[PDB]
Design a binder for this molecule. Sequence first.
Ligand SMILES: CCCCCCCCCCCCCCCCCC(=O)OC[C@H](COP(=O)([O-])OCC[N+](C)(C)C)OC(=O)CCCCCCCCCCCCCCCCC
Ligand code: SF4
Ligand code: SF4
Ligand code: SF4
Ligand code: SF4
Ligand code: FES
Ligand SMILES: [K+]
Ligand SMILES: [Zn+2]
Lengths: 48, 176, 114, 379, 116, 96, 95, 263, 207, 129
Amino acid sequence: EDNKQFFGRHRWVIYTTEMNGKNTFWDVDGSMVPPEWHRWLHCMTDDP
Amino acid sequence: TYKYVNLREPSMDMKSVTDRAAQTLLWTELIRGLGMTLSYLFREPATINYPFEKGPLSPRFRGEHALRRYPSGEERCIACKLCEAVCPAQAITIEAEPRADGSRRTTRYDIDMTKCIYCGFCQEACPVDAIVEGPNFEFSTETHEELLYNKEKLLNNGDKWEAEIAANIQADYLYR
Amino acid sequence: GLLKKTTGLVGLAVCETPHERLKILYTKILDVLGHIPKNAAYRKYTEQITNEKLSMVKAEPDVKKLEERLQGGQIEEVILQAENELSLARKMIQWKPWEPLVEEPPASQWKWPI
Amino acid sequence: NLTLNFGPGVLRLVMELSGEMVRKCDPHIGLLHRGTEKLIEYKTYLQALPYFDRLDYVSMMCNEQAYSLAVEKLLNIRPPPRAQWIRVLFGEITRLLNHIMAVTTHALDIGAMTPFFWMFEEREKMFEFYERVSGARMHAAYVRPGGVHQDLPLGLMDDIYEFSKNFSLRIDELEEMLTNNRIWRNRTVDIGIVTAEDALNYGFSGVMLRGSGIQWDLRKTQPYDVYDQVEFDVPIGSRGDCYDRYLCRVEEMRQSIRIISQCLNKMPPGEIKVDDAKVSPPKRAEMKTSMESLIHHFKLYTEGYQVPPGATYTAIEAPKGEFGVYLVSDGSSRPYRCKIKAPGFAHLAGLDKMSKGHMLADVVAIIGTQDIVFGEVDR
Amino acid sequence: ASTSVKPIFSRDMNEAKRRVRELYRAWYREVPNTVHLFQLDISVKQGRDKVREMFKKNAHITDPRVVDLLVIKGKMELEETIKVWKQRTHVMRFFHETEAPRPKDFLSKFYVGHDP
Amino acid sequence: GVRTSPTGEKVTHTGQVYDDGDYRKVRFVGRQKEVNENFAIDLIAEQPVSQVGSRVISCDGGGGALGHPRVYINLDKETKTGTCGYCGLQFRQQHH
Amino acid sequence: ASATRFIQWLRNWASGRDLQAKLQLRYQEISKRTQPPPKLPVGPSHKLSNNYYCTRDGRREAMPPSIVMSSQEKKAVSPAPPIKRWELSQDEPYL
Amino acid sequence: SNLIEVFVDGQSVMVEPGTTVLQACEKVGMQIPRFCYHERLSVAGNCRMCLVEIEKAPKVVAACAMPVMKGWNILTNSEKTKKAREGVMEFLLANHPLDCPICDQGGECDLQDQSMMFGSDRSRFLEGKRAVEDKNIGPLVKTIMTRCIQCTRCIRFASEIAGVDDLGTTGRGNDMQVGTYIEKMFMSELSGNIIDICPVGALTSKPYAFTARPWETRKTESIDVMDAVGSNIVVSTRTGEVMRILPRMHEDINEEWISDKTR
Amino acid sequence: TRPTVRPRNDVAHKQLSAFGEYVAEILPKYVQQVQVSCFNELEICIHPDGVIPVLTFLRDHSNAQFKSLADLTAVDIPTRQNRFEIVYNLLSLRFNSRIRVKTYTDELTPIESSVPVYKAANWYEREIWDMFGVFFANHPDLRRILTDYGFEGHPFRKDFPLSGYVELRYDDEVKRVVAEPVELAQEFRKFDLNSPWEAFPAYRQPP
Amino acid sequence: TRDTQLITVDEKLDITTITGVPEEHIKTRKARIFVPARNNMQSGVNNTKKWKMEFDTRERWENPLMGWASTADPLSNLVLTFSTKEDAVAFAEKNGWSYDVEERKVPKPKSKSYGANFSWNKRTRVSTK
Ligand SMILES: CCCCCCCCCCCCCCCCCC(=O)OC[C@H](COP(=O)([O-])OCC[N+](C)(C)C)OC(=O)CCCCCCCCCCCCCCCCC
Ligand code: SF4
Ligand code: SF4
Ligand code: SF4
Ligand code: SF4
Ligand code: FES
Ligand SMILES: [K+]
Ligand SMILES: [Zn+2]
């Protein structure tokens, strides 16, 4: 997080390079965010 | 009360006529339009870095469907078919029968996600918070058949998004 | 007083002699209504309102003050409505909509709900 | 002459051109005819509500409001004061959404692309107000016969204030690009002139009437909800051309901000749907504890409420013009007939007249100035 | 009284039949243009056979008002074809080139299903 | 619980499984059959019976307004346990 | 908001306006995404007495249309009084 | 000749002596609310939902049981009549369980539909509800007796039509219970008909349990062929399947009853 | 006043009743029934021959000035001999009022086109012909407006099936979009929602 | 009184050719004109007021993919409402359909006497209340 950035860019996720056996170094996808962080990353809450 | 948008008489003194002549010949008001786009070039763009950044949503967002459970693991749905009656698109198909233990449970629960208009009437109608629209909006498929959900898919979504579906319901049920 | 520069409405030109045009049109309307039978309700009502507007044209020479009496918008809109009234009177003589009802409807034509 | 087939909402123009001039314009519609009016006859009054979000899909909550006003009239019930203020609040936010689309896509069609991107960063912020109240960015289904679905979430009115505090500056940036631009003026001034009497006889409404000097606006002549408790001015054109209608829409955006500034200060407390469980569903916390509330929740969502037999024509001042529904009730839970009067249906029918003696490139300007969306024309 | 009905265009079958023949001539003259303009693979003989079949379907009508509507609809159908409002798909919908022949006899209908 | 028929295909909580000679099994070739491994009939049987000291008890599924409509369960019969019609929780009277 | 002072002047001059006071990008001045729970009010019909439904039943007060004339001297009238002429706005009569 | 003239909302109607207020209202097309009255059972007059005002009469009368006297004006829509119904509907729903979603009668319940039309729209009952024990009367009729509204339709049917005096009322006051007292199966060839006459979900069809909702079934009117009586039935289908069989009225053949084999 | 009941405007109900009699006296030859609803809407029911006279009177008369055709549509009621019902909604800007004019027709009887009175009726009548099959005489250009080219039938009639009789499809053999008889992988489920208990006694019909 | 020329047509009204219905669904269909039977689960009689016209049920099969209920009958859901029996037959005849008409079944009036429950010498006496 970086709260000096304008709303919408103040939270971001750097995806993992491997998930469930799939090489995600280049092939990142928005559906790789687990539900617990999916609520925080979309600003549905302020509590990580 | 009304106002006129384009009811004006331009002044006809030589000072004003020469101003309009200067504008016609020196392109003054066109260059003024170049200064408005030059300013934007030196502003911060509003673009976000998707998929690493995501657009803000609220707890009320209506996304992918899911069937929920009680904390014990029992299904919340008791096959009342209210969601099937209210569904404006007729996207819900339900069949039920007494379960081996005698409970009122569904044997078929399909949502045709290609008839559905993602309206939320099914979760309003449900009296036990069984059928909800979750926060996921990133479930596009490569085939039309993957979007005809049955009870197994919907129960898998619920067990997959309960951690986040429960939190959203906790943040909005007082408005309902 | 001073002639208006524009009527505000597009395509509705300014009339420089509103009083003269109105007395001509109201008098023409009353002449045409003379061909309608006396018992006709269109004649009795149309004359009643035509005379009131004519009686107000021959009572106030101020155009801005005549509009406040007629309550029909700008004086150019009153003239246009006078022309429309005249065009209707000529058309009503052909139609003769004071005769009895041409035909009553079927038994349940206007019953709702069915 | 030369007969051409322009087109691929999606429209088909069968034009007859004598060189550069247009001799007759023959719009062919129905490319987006979906049988909405026939489908509504198989739905309950609640089930038919999402259909109106999808007629004029740039002014979603104004379509919902017109239908709700019609059903509320046949029901003979009255929404509570807070719901009415919410409807006016989001009716004027919806007017901004539509006028941005109308002005900026109009400019985009005639080659001015930049303002579209500026003002769609404000639409993206107004779509967040839609999403925070209803959960859907566009097709909220938030306005319903009886009031609104849910109450405003806490803090939404502060964010509406922050947005409206800066929107005037965004309109000025738009005007700095178009209003005094000589290229923009040459494409709109003296284009598509409509006289006041032709405008009325051809069934026009909205800025089509007001661009030609006709002083008419249903928010002031036939007020609905609480529009009679808000102060605003109705812009009036003088030339009756595309440029005057462009100014009317831009000034109407400023008057919406003026109204929105009052709905935020005059918002009352209370409930947000009629306290009558035979029309509006009970609260969920009482549907789970009271027998009467459970029966009414069960019936309102399965059968729906019955509307007394009758027929009404209800109209509102939608962003695109007079939007109205002729709604017929037979006493059952489902409408017998629902004719939708779309303002763009009469405007488009007048394209042939408005395009007389104009170049082929002026037809694009004329269609843009009528603000046509073919969801409501075709239905 | 009861049988008094306002007409559309014709006052009796003789007047109605005149319009039918005029429409038939208009269609007959048009088929060659439709085949060439739409690049249809049918022949002019097939097209004119289809026009004849359409006219012969409504040869049992004895109500002038019903005939006037048939002619009014036919004129509209001709207009859509002459002005090329229709496309090659709309013209080829009179021939049903993709529907397998439905059985006509009792035994053939008995095997496939229950529809009579 | 989850069990497999004599062809390798899992059986759903509704008892659904394709017969050995059903052509509809071809849809799972190169793919998978989606089955929820959290059979609810089994999980609800793991909940201990609640021992309450009154003839009539109420259940709302837990959570107040986040549960299910409040029902009242009679406990007079001493041969069976009063079960909730919505959530399946069982209740018993304290030895009388 | 991260623009250097030189760039702020350049953008402000080119647009002829003070943009830094009205930015189109939202910052901390927005509402917190987690808010305290509400307690919404209840309508006028939440009463335990003097609240019979027959005294507030809107649907049951609607009546069938009144027939003013069915097929099965007097001053003329109009549908309503003529609309009163609008006044110019004193906020801004001319744009 | 011997008819007498009465008034329903002021409209004159000629009725025979002994005609009830409820039957006089039928002739003018008005159906008085009801839970305990059935035109093929004896009159009981216990649910009190049929209370109607008679002009000049201080006290509301039970339409189902009160014979209509000459010159009476029946006010089926006055405030006193409307308040009488809301009061009875309020009592009738006080102890009733919130079982509509899990109740097989939902969507075709005479307690739901007369709460929507003649009752109030909200509750003011702040106490705890009453729950009752479930009887087991056979493999056809499922009994969830917390839903019973003590209307005694099943008692009068089992006694007067099926000729089986096995159902009755045990207890007294708010604890009055309908049942067999002892553990007894109600197995008569007409037993399944208590499912229909019961206006609530207390008596439902065990074979049909949980399988459908009434609004989604398509109704096909047919003839029973299980015997030679030729009873008229309604075949309820849904999505190409036969869901249940209901009786269809025919005064000259079967009235509104069918045998258990037909059902 | 009850917070949940729509308030009644008795002043406007009296004005609209008075003007209804006004129209019923000036045009006796056509007006068949005049009525005013509880929400203050005025309906003038006319014989179909009186379309041009009545509409012209309402447009041109000085006490009418109904210069805007808000809408023009039809209703299909199969139980009537004249199943179709043509409804004209007119708006007066002078008197800030609205009036509704209703007539009737059947499948074979034409109705005189009102394009001469209101030029807005051009497309509104092409839609009535396209969706209901009513024919309008002397219409400058009458033809389908909403339905597909060559589409057979009139969809908005009450006896026309909701899903129609044909559906489109692309066929690779003939390399074009074809039309075939409609088959549905899931049939539109029909719900019988009407309650068997009367809801509105005020609208009860005599037996 | 109508100042418009009329004509005389002596033939029965028949619109089968100007409705767009495929011939399969005119000749082979059997309309059923009836007053719906009261739903026996309820005592209300407000659904037994109007005449209805339904058509003959045809095949519904199972969608191979989902098991849904497919149909090839475009008239499967068509139900028309009519105020009287004659209005219903008039509408079926002019559309060329073949119909069966079932006469209305009104429940005959009955003699209800609450005093018969306490008869001195008759079997109408009830053993319980
Ligand atoms: C004593 C010494 C005497 C010596 C001679 C003195 C000369 C005095 C000055 C001469 C007059 C000045 C002539 C200027 C050119 C005239 C232009 C003109 O015709 O305007 C009228 C035209 C027409 O104007 P109009 O549309 O209003 O119509 C005018 C005529 N009526 C109204 C009758 C139809 O305007 C335009 O040229 C349109 C401009 C479109 C271009 C848009 C892009 C502009 C972006 C700015 C680019 C800047 C370019 C810089 C390039 C630098 C390259 C190194
Ligand atoms: S969101 Fe709406 S359309 Fe989708 S399943 Fe739920 S009720 Fe049906
Ligand atoms: S999801 Fe909810 S509304 Fe739908 S059948 Fe299950 S319990 Fe009823
Ligand atoms: S009997 Fe009727 S009111 Fe009672 S739970 Fe069942 S459906 Fe609901
Ligand atoms: S079980 Fe049913 S029929 Fe018997 S008394 Fe109770 S409610 Fe009446
Ligand atoms: S119906 Fe009369 S008291 Fe029960
Ligand atoms: K029952
Ligand atoms: Zn529970």
